Design an enzyme around this catalytic site. Structure first.
Site, PDB file in Angstrom:
ATOM      1  N   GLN A  39       0.811  -1.232   0.000  1.00 18.31           N
ATOM      2  CA  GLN A  39       0.000   0.000   0.000  1.00 18.31           C
ATOM      3  C   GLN A  39       0.841   1.277   0.000  1.00 18.31           C
ATOM      4  O   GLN A  39       1.990   1.263   0.501  1.00 18.31           O
ATOM      5  CB  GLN A  39      -0.907  -0.022   1.247  1.00 18.31           C
ATOM      6  CG  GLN A  39      -0.127  -0.179   2.556  1.00 18.31           C
ATOM      7  CD  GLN A  39      -0.946  -0.697   3.712  1.00 18.31           C
ATOM      8  OE1 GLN A  39      -2.158  -0.585   3.750  1.00 18.31           O
ATOM      9  NE2 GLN A  39      -0.261  -1.241   4.695  1.00 18.31           N
ATOM     10  N   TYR A  69     -11.955   5.306  18.750  1.00 17.73           N
ATOM     11  CA  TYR A  69     -11.883   3.970  18.115  1.00 17.73           C
ATOM     12  C   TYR A  69     -11.106   2.980  18.995  1.00 17.73           C
ATOM     13  O   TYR A  69     -11.608   1.904  19.335  1.00 17.73           O
ATOM     14  CB  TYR A  69     -11.213   4.089  16.755  1.00 17.73           C
ATOM     15  CG  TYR A  69     -11.137   2.808  15.971  1.00 17.73           C
ATOM     16  CD1 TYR A  69     -12.226   2.324  15.274  1.00 17.73           C
ATOM     17  CD2 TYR A  69      -9.941   2.158  15.809  1.00 17.73           C
ATOM     18  CE1 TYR A  69     -12.134   1.172  14.499  1.00 17.73           C
ATOM     19  CE2 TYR A  69      -9.830   1.000  15.064  1.00 17.73           C
ATOM     20  CZ  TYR A  69     -10.932   0.493  14.396  1.00 17.73           C
ATOM     21  OH  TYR A  69     -10.802  -0.650  13.629  1.00 17.73           O
ATOM     22  N   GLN A  70      -9.878   3.319  19.348  1.00 14.70           N
ATOM     23  CA  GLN A  70      -8.940   2.406  20.039  1.00 14.70           C
ATOM     24  C   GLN A  70      -9.487   1.988  21.413  1.00 14.70           C
ATOM     25  O   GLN A  70      -9.298   0.813  21.807  1.00 14.70           O
ATOM     26  CB  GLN A  70      -7.562   3.066  20.081  1.00 14.70           C
ATOM     27  CG  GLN A  70      -6.887   3.177  18.714  1.00 14.70           C
ATOM     28  CD  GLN A  70      -5.604   3.974  18.832  1.00 14.70           C
ATOM     29  OE1 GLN A  70      -5.338   4.570  19.868  1.00 14.70           O
ATOM     30  NE2 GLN A  70      -4.823   4.052  17.769  1.00 14.70           N
ATOM     31  N   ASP A  94      -0.949   2.404  14.756  1.00 10.38           N
ATOM     32  CA  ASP A  94       0.144   3.147  15.431  1.00 10.38           C
ATOM     33  C   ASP A  94       0.513   2.522  16.787  1.00 10.38           C
ATOM     34  O   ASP A  94       1.278   3.199  17.530  1.00 10.38           O
ATOM     35  CB  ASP A  94      -0.224   4.627  15.544  1.00 10.38           C
ATOM     36  CG  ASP A  94      -1.376   4.972  16.474  1.00 10.38           C
ATOM     37  OD1 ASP A  94      -2.058   4.034  16.901  1.00 10.38           O
ATOM     38  OD2 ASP A  94      -1.575   6.201  16.743  1.00 10.38           O
ATOM     39  N   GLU A 114       0.667  -7.879  11.703  1.00 10.20           N
ATOM     40  CA  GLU A 114       0.599  -6.772  10.718  1.00 10.20           C
ATOM     41  C   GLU A 114       1.377  -7.238   9.501  1.00 10.20           C
ATOM     42  O   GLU A 114       2.566  -7.511   9.631  1.00 10.20           O
ATOM     43  CB  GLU A 114       1.169  -5.475  11.299  1.00 10.20           C
ATOM     44  CG  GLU A 114       1.219  -4.314  10.304  1.00 10.20           C
ATOM     45  CD  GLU A 114      -0.088  -4.053   9.578  1.00 10.20           C
ATOM     46  OE1 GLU A 114      -0.067  -4.039   8.342  1.00 10.20           O
ATOM     47  OE2 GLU A 114      -1.125  -3.871  10.263  1.00 10.20           O
ATOM     48  N   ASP A 145       0.596 -12.355   7.512  1.00 15.49           N
ATOM     49  CA  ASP A 145      -0.851 -12.372   7.182  1.00 15.49           C
ATOM     50  C   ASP A 145      -1.651 -12.970   8.359  1.00 15.49           C
ATOM     51  O   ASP A 145      -1.275 -14.053   8.878  1.00 15.49           O
ATOM     52  CB  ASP A 145      -1.040 -13.144   5.877  1.00 15.49           C
ATOM     53  CG  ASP A 145      -2.486 -13.433   5.496  1.00 15.49           C
ATOM     54  OD1 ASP A 145      -3.387 -12.705   5.961  1.00 15.49           O
ATOM     55  OD2 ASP A 145      -2.690 -14.403   4.734  1.00 15.49           O
ATOM     56  N   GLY A 146      -2.735 -12.298   8.755  1.00 18.47           N
ATOM     57  CA  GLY A 146      -3.495 -12.635   9.971  1.00 18.47           C
ATOM     58  C   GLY A 146      -4.509 -13.735   9.714  1.00 18.47           C
ATOM     59  O   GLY A 146      -4.907 -14.421  10.691  1.00 18.47           O
ATOM     60  N   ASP A 164      -8.702  -5.101  13.746  1.00 21.67           N
ATOM     61  CA  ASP A 164      -8.494  -3.666  13.448  1.00 21.67           C
ATOM     62  C   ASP A 164      -8.063  -3.537  11.973  1.00 21.67           C
ATOM     63  O   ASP A 164      -6.837  -3.330  11.657  1.00 21.67           O
ATOM     64  CB  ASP A 164      -7.512  -3.034  14.422  1.00 21.67           C
ATOM     65  CG  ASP A 164      -7.300  -1.556  14.167  1.00 21.67           C
ATOM     66  OD1 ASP A 164      -8.223  -0.905  13.517  1.00 21.67           O
ATOM     67  OD2 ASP A 164      -6.239  -1.053  14.612  1.00 21.67           O
ATOM     68  N   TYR A 231     -13.301   9.517  10.631  1.00 19.05           N
ATOM     69  CA  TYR A 231     -13.781   8.443   9.724  1.00 19.05           C
ATOM     70  C   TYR A 231     -14.957   8.991   8.927  1.00 19.05           C
ATOM     71  O   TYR A 231     -15.599   9.935   9.365  1.00 19.05           O
ATOM     72  CB  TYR A 231     -14.103   7.143  10.449  1.00 19.05           C
ATOM     73  CG  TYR A 231     -12.916   6.376  10.961  1.00 19.05           C
ATOM     74  CD1 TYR A 231     -11.681   6.463  10.375  1.00 19.05           C
ATOM     75  CD2 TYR A 231     -13.057   5.475  11.996  1.00 19.05           C
ATOM     76  CE1 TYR A 231     -10.598   5.739  10.855  1.00 19.05           C
ATOM     77  CE2 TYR A 231     -11.986   4.800  12.543  1.00 19.05           C
ATOM     78  CZ  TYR A 231     -10.744   4.932  11.964  1.00 19.05           C
ATOM     79  OH  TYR A 231      -9.674   4.268  12.479  1.00 19.05           O
TER      80      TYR A 231
END
Lengths: 290, 284
Positions: A39, A69-70, A94, A114, A145-146, A164, A231
């Site tokens: 990305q 959000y967090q 982050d 991540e 990869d999750g 997330d 958002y």
């Protein structure tokens, strides 16, 4: 297109996931522009929202509002169950979600996946006061990869999975097989919380998300939402589901959330807003309730 | 205000939300007046239907106005028994009137709108909601609500709704004297509901409204918030104030209520559960 050709130092969040609308932010500095294997990556210093992380032209967080959000994506699941020990996070952002998980003193292990090391590196360099998140000795960072990680996980390992993710574009994280993988990786009555988009913008995407979860997870299945100004539509939602097993009540916390305190007070989450987050507007309520 | 950041797009700029603007792609411009009071635009938006704008500031869009109009109306009106007499300051597009008219015990809806152009634009460009004005119980005054209100018979009103713009001469609607005016014109335990800005952008201004409100209204003083995508920060809030008189509990509606799209009894309560950063400040 996203940076104004008309007047200097305006960023506009254009997407066909939110057609005919953009949140425009005055930008003082671009601190980082970068192209990983996955990305496009931008960090800027905004005039009024502090530092802003953008992936593929989509705002992922600002310093000013990330707490909404967090704190909600972490405390809605983790305060709903007693004494959570083992947690999986999919997506690093982050580190601010890791920081929220680490307030819970019962937690022993935080596994986090991540796929994009550039996102991790960018957090540590440009968002270091939140990216201390990554340094908690309970934290186990997998650059990978999750979806695969979860297929590969031992059955019944986790108390909680937090997903997330960015927008379904990332698209596999919103589908039945990924959820079946989550169901299997959770202990009985373990919880999942996922990023479930805007009730204003994606009623159709959310109806399918809730249908998949109602089918896979045989414990509880609930939908919550929170104010996130940066958002699109100014709100985002969450799936809260429990696997088959002990009773889970997402609607109220069990638990409220050291001599040396590593964390500031909660800025957004509290026991009252935990409950409030599950009270939807009538246009949304009709659908999600079945 | 048009094509200021993106060609073909309305951008909402204001020193009331520095460093940010909501941008909406414009399909076509439908109207452009300059009344004796403010600059008036209606445009047909790409994805939020028709949009009203006063002095460069979004007043409403067809897609999301339900969230403002149902909350400023039903939070006060479902917190008291059988409201009969109601005053609205501000006409908008008749949406608030339409929502007040859902309350079948309401006999009289006084509404002040100083700017007649606002009313004419509503009826012309927003006709299906502008029906709010047409209901037989509505008594429309083209005039200053501040003045209308200081001139009201003491204890006349069950409820006042202040559907104001930003505290930018509108700023009077946010100050002690106007609040005393309302406390006076309300019956004992009568209620007021005011447009009270964004907890994200305006904690200072909100703190001063709350404090002002808490001096004047000796009943309940509470803050509530709601999602409105096309208002700055994506949320707006409300003061809920009861005058001295019978107790009012704004968090627990005493009653239930072209269908409602947003408001319901569950969201009624949730609207008073503020984030921790707001909840501390706003409480004492």
């Amino acid at each position: 297109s996203c940076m104004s050709s008309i007047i200097p130092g305006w960023f506009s969040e254009i997407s066909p996931m939110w057609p005919g609308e953009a949140h425009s932010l005055k930008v003082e500095k671009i601190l980082f522009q970068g192209k990983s294997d996955y990305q496009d990556v931008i960090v800027f210093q905004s005039a009024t929202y502090g530092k802003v992380l953008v992936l593929d032209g989509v705002i992922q967080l600002t310093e000013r509002d990330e707490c909404a959000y967090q704190e909600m994506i972490t405390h809605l699941p983790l305060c709903s169950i007693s004494n959570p020990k083992k947690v999986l996070v999919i997506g690093g952002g982050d580190g601010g979600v890791l920081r929220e998980v680490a307030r819970h003193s019962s937690v022993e292990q935080i596994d986090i996946c991540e796929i994009d090391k550039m996102v991790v590196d960018v957090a540590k360099q440009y968002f270091p006061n939140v990216a201390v998140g990554y340094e908690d000795p309970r934290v186990n960072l997998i650059i990978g990869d999750g979806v695969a990680f979860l297929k590969n996980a031992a059955e019944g390992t986790y108390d909680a999975v937090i997903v997330d993710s960015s927008d379904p574009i990332a698209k596999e994280l919103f589908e039945k097989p990924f959820f079946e993988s989550v169901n299997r990786a959770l202990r009985p009555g373990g919880v999942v919380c996922t990023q479930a988009e805007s009730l204003w913008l994606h009623m159709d995407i959310i109806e399918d998300i809730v249908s998949n979860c109602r089918d896979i997870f045989k414990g509880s299945v609930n939908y919550a939402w929170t104010s996130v100004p940066t958002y699109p539509s100014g709100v985002i939602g969450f799936m809260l589901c429990s696997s088959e097993g002990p009773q889970v009540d997402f609607k109220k916390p069990v638990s409220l959330i050291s001599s040396i305190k590593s964390h500031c007070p909660l800025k957004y989450y509290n026991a009252e807003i935990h409950s409030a987050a599950f009270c939807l507007p009538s246009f949304a309520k009709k659908v999600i309730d079945s």
